[PDB]
Amino acid sequence: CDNLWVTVYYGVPVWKDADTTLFCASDACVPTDPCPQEIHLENVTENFNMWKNNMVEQMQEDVISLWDQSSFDPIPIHYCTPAGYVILKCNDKNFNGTGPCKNVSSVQCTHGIKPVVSTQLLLNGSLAEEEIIIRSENLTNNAKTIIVHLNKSVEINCTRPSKAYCEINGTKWNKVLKQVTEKLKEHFNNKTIIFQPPSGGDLEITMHSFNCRGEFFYCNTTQLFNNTCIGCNGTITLPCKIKQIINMWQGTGQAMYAPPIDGKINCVSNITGILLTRDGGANNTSNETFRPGGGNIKDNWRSELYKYKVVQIEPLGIA
Amino acid sequence: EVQLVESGGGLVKPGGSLRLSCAASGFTFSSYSMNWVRQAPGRGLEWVSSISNTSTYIYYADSVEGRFTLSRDNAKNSLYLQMNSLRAEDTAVYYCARANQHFDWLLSLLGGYHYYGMDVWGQGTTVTVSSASTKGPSVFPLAPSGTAALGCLVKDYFPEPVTVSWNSGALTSGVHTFPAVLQSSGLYSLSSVVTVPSSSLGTQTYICNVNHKPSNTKVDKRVEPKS
Amino acid sequence: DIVMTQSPLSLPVTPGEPASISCRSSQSLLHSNGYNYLDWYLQKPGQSPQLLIYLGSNRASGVPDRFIGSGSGTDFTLKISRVEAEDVGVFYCMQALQAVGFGPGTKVEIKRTVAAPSVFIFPPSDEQLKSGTASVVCLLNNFYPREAKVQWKVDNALQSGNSQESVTEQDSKDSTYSLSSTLTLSKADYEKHKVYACEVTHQGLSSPVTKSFNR
Ligand SMILES: *[C@@H]1O[C@H](CO[C@@H]2O[C@@H](C)[C@@H](O)[C@@H](O)[C@@H]2O)[C@@H](O[C@@H]2O[C@H](CO)[C@@H](O[C@@H]3O[C@H](CO)[C@@H](O)[C@H](O)[C@@H]3O)[C@H](O)[C@H]2NC(C)=O)[C@H](O)[C@H]1NC(C)=O
Ligand SMILES: *[C@@H]1O[C@H](CO)[C@@H](O)[C@H](O)[C@H]1NC(C)=O
Ligand SMILES: *[C@@H]1O[C@H](CO)[C@@H](O)[C@H](O)[C@H]1NC(C)=O
Ligand SMILES: *[C@@H]1O[C@H](CO)[C@@H](O)[C@H](O)[C@H]1NC(C)=O
Ligand SMILES: *[C@@H]1O[C@H](CO)[C@@H](O)[C@H](O)[C@H]1NC(C)=O
Ligand SMILES: *[C@@H]1O[C@H](CO)[C@@H](O)[C@H](O)[C@H]1NC(C)=O
Ligand SMILES: *[C@@H]1O[C@H](CO)[C@@H](O)[C@H](O)[C@H]1NC(C)=O
Ligand SMILES: *[C@@H]1O[C@H](CO)[C@@H](O)[C@H](O)[C@H]1NC(C)=O
Ligand SMILES: *[C@@H]1O[C@H](CO)[C@@H](O)[C@H](O)[C@H]1NC(C)=O
Ligand SMILES: *[C@@H]1O[C@H](CO)[C@@H](O)[C@H](O)[C@H]1NC(C)=O
Ligand SMILES: *[C@@H]1O[C@H](CO)[C@@H](O)[C@H](O)[C@H]1NC(C)=O
Ligand SMILES: *[C@@H]1O[C@H](CO)[C@@H](O)[C@H](O)[C@H]1NC(C)=O
């Protein structure tokens, strides 16, 4: 069913701003159409918002409906739009996060997005297409989330000996950390950036928590921000704990599990994004403090649904 | 009524711009799609663009996308078409015509069939694109020799048109003036001939009278048997 | 895109007996609505086009009932019962499924008891030789039908992309044609060779009878 022949929209706009019910699709969900469609709207300057979009909500609802009904491993899944409506796509290369981009086309279903459930770091995620790009709502309110969209996938190897661990090639770690340091320095009128392990609260935010094969690993990221790095350059192994019993990222309450088997339990993944936070208060100072925190899992879908925005189709649009 | 009147068109050097307009007068304008359709000299009809009753969903052709621009205001009851930048092959005779619609949902997002009834057509307006302007040298005829024929040749002129008449309007018996062509240099060139009873040669004179007006040059040429 | 074809690319008719031309797309035109998205237009010379049929078979107002549209899907057939001399035009076939597509035209003329051209040949004269080029002219006159070929041959060698041809229109009183082909040569390339000639093959010519000249 390849070929569309007529793939650009000319004339007065024909899409407003709303929000409806979009349904999952993969290969409950439906077969992803193997003939995706795209249409460019020339000389259309558009503006999107990644924090006030009524999508991350539906993603959270589908993820909860997914874990409730539940081998185990993330599945790349789309988000198709009902008839009469269309998803808009911001294809600009270096998108700040919000505001306007001037290269916008319209899909029908989004791209495959595997729902990763982790804090501090983002794994198994699409990389950006140019430089390290930062995203936040307010750059003054230090109690707001902070996303570092990287541009070099870094493999991680979390393994269980049949007190588990995670191996990471530390040289690329030091290099990507130097790059992130460069970009933060730029985004703060060239200030001295400094990092720190997370503060109080449950081990949910103090340790880097993630899911794997059914178990959950909480890692101590002590070394990953050893500022004497900026040894260090050799391959480095973070000891982590297979914490069976967690805090409910399932609504409200808790849950339980069963101890493991005498076999290798291993996840190799791609670190492709970072969740940080900020200190502040006493500033003053010639320094910028940063600890990883985030906490809220919605941020993850935020980080991966920035470019899409639902619109309602109707002719006669008015400028 | 019911009518559309076109305005615009003429010599415009390449890289330039132009504006055509269609004045609508006698129908409910804000209730029909409007379509622009050209026609090269010698070639056939070619659709150019289409725009809907609410000035939405504009379909451009291939040789027109990115260059031309179709605007509208359903109050002034006019069309407007902005041609830029121009190539030498856009030389055509442009036409505007209304057209019924039937919007559809099956063409990805939206999409109507902008054009399916073109009953009322414009008057047609010409648009030429070349370079420079010159006279029109009618460089001699010849009649080498049952019942022969001869005629004048008018080459290397610009622009259209030129008119020839034989013996200052005397002869029309089986005379043929040919539709001019466009040489690879840029100028137009045509010819004109007249079947003459062979015995009438060497007694009655045959003089061709050419009239290139955008140079105010008229010439009279004498056909001499075997020159 | 969508390719459109017509046939026959020329169809001489008679003021009286019927006629029919055909159009074929490359994709079917239905839309699950029952009626086809294809129109039929006419172009009378000098004057602007008209509209004959819209949406498959339905006839526009003002058009006589002698114009019948047929076909569905990919094959379409404009049939005309009875004709007269008001239809000497060019019948175009238009598609309206995706964007808008026209056809190549189906030129229509009158049928005429086939007559044969009287070819004439013209050298370029010393004044044009003094200028800077040389144009030799071959002429077909009072011939029918429109189909004829002119191949330029200098010293029996076949020419190529250097000749321009032009036809007239069906002459009013006789329903015949005339054609002129010009060959352009460099000022000296002319005097390089000796024998020039043109090669005509009209349909009313069993033998490609032709004309030549030296110098
Ligand atoms: C421009 O044209 C569009 C499309 O209409 C089509 O083209 C016109 C040129 C006419 O020839 C029409 O006969 C032809 O169908 C018009 O859009 C249409 O607008 C009307 C109301 O403005 C819509 O009517 C709706 O109908 C539904 C039933 O399905 C009702 O429930 C609604 O309450 C409403 O009345 C109609 O849906 C819409 N066309 C389509 C295909 O949906 C447009 O109004 C016209 N503009 C002007 C200024 O006339
Ligand atoms: C086309 O793009 C230019 C880019 O600056 C913009 O200024 C202009 O407004 C656009 N055209 C329209 C009709 O908005
Ligand atoms: C917009 O972005 C897409 C992909 O990001 C690209 O293919 C397209 O060329 C861009 N638009 C323009 C006008 O270049
Ligand atoms: C959004 O882009 C503007 C530039 O137009 C930039 O100044 C701003 O910092 C960006 N927003 C964020 C949150 O980075
Ligand atoms: C993960 O990284 C590897 C590098 O070997 C790359 O080939 C692969 O495409 C990446 N996949 C994802 C989902 O990031
Ligand atoms: C990543 O971004 C940095 C920005 O400092 C840039 O220098 C580097 O070339 C980028 N690399 C890739 C692979 O995109
Ligand atoms: C962020 O919040 C602070 C309040 O601490 C406010 O002064 C600032 O204006 C906000 N940011 C922007 C871009 O307005
Ligand atoms: C992950 O670690 C195991 C254990 O040392 C190793 O054998 C394997 O090669 C590692 N994975 C990759 C992709 O290198
Ligand atoms: C780790 O990264 C460095 C940085 O270039 C590279 O030279 C080295 O080969 C990497 N190690 C492995 C095992 O890939
Ligand atoms: C992480 O390790 C450091 C020492 O390397 C330790 O002081 C700290 O308590 C550990 N983190 C947690 C949450 O216990
Ligand atoms: C950084 O690494 C060095 C070893 O190279 C170690 O002595 C030091 O305690 C580390 N610092 C932190 C804050 O972990
Ligand atoms: C990411 O995907 C890889 C396979 O591409 C898988 O091994 C890994 O377990 C996934 N990440 C997590 C956190 O499970």
Rounded to whole angstroms, what are the CA distances from A174 to A26, A132, A134, A169, A181?
37, 15, 19, 9, 10
Tokens of B31: 């209730």
A5 vs C contacts (CB less than 8 Å): 1-2, 98
Tokens of B99: 């057209």
Alpha-carbon distance of A230 to B112, in angstroms, equals: 61
Resolution in angstroms, to 1 decimal, for this deposition? 3.5
What Rg do the C-alpha atoms of chain A give, in angstroms?
21
Instruction: Write the residue in B47, B139, B179 that is nearest to C131 by C-beta.
Output: B139
At A167 the three-state DSSP class reads strand
Which technique was the structure solved with, according to the deposited record? Answer: X-ray
Beta strand pairing call for A23-26 and A30-31: parallel
Calculate ∠ Cα B131-B136-B142, nearest 5°.
Answer: 140
Inter-residue contact B152 to B192 (CB < 8 Å): yes
Q: Is the dihedral of CA A45, A49, A55, A60 positive or negative?
A: positive
User: Ligand 3 pocket: which of A103, A126, A306 to mutate (most atoms <8 Å of CB)?
Assistant: A103
Alpha-carbon distance of B97 to C156, in angstroms, equals: 52
Q: Is the dihedral of CA B178, B182, B185, B188 positive or negative?
A: positive
Interchain CB contact of A66 with B (< 8 Å):
no
Spell out the residues 6+ positions from residue C130 whose beta carbon is closer than 8 angstroms to its own.
none
Alpha-carbon distance of C68 to C53, in angstroms, equals: 8
Is there a cis peptide before residue B55, judged by omega within 30 degrees of 0?
no
A91 lines ligand 3 (CB under 6 A): yes
Chain C residue with Cα closest to B36:
C100
Interchain CB contact of C199 with B (< 8 Å):
no
SS3 content of chain C, % helix, strand, coil (to 5): 5, 50, 45
Q: Is the dihedral of CA A95, A100, A106, A110 positive or negative?
A: positive
The residue type at B151:
G
User: Ligand 11 pocket: which of A222, A226, A236, A237 to mutate (most atoms <8 Å of CB)?
Assistant: A226
The side-by-side arrangement of strands in the sheet containing A104-106 is: A8-9, A39-41, A104-106, A85-90, A308-312
Give the residue among B104, B108, C73, B66 at the shortest CA–CA distance from A3. B108
Alpha-carbon distance of B127 to B90, in angstroms, equals: 8
Instruction: Write the residue in C127, C139, C168 that is nearest to B139 by C-beta.
Output: C127
Domains of chain A and any CATH numbers: 8-115+304-312 (2.170.40.20), 121-296 (2.170.40.20)
A220 lines ligand 10 (CB under 6 A): yes
Helix (H) or strand (E) holding A265: strand A265-278
**Can you say whether residue B203 is alpha, beta or left, with left for phi > 0 and alpha for psi between -120 and 50 degrees?**
alpha
Rounded to whole angstroms, what are the CA distances from B225 to A82, B152, B203, C122, C136?
84, 13, 11, 12, 17
Interchain CB contact of C98 with A (< 8 Å):
yes
Inter-residue contact A171 to A154 (CB < 8 Å): no
Alpha-carbon distance of A52 to A97, in angstroms, equals: 12
Alpha-carbon distance of A215 to A44, in angstroms, equals: 47
Is there a cis peptide before residue B159, judged by omega within 30 degrees of 0?
yes
At A23 the three-state DSSP class reads strand
Tokens of C162: 């250097």
The side-by-side arrangement of strands in the sheet containing B33-39 is: B59-60, B45-51, B33-39, B92-99, B125-127
What Rg do the C-alpha atoms of chain C give, in angstroms?
22
A30 has which bridge partners?
A25
Tokens of A28: 């409950």
Atom of ligand 1 nearest to the CA of B104: 41
Alpha-carbon distance of C8 to C21, in angstroms, equals: 6
Beta strand pairing call for C10-13 and C106-110: parallel
Residue nearest to atom 11 of ligand 7 (CA): A138
Beta strand pairing call for C90-95 and C38-43: antiparallel
Q: How many angstroms from the chain centroid is the CA of residue C79?
A: 21
CB neighbours of residue B39 within 10 Å: 20
Alpha-carbon distance of C108 to B160, in angstroms, equals: 27
Spell out the residues 6+ positions from residue A69 whose beta carbon is closer than 8 angstroms to its own.
none
Q: Is the dihedral of CA A48, A52, A58, A61 positive or negative?
A: positive
User: Phi/psi of residue A161, each to 5°?
Assistant: -75, 125
Q: How far does C71 lie from chain A, in Å, by closest CA?
A: 25
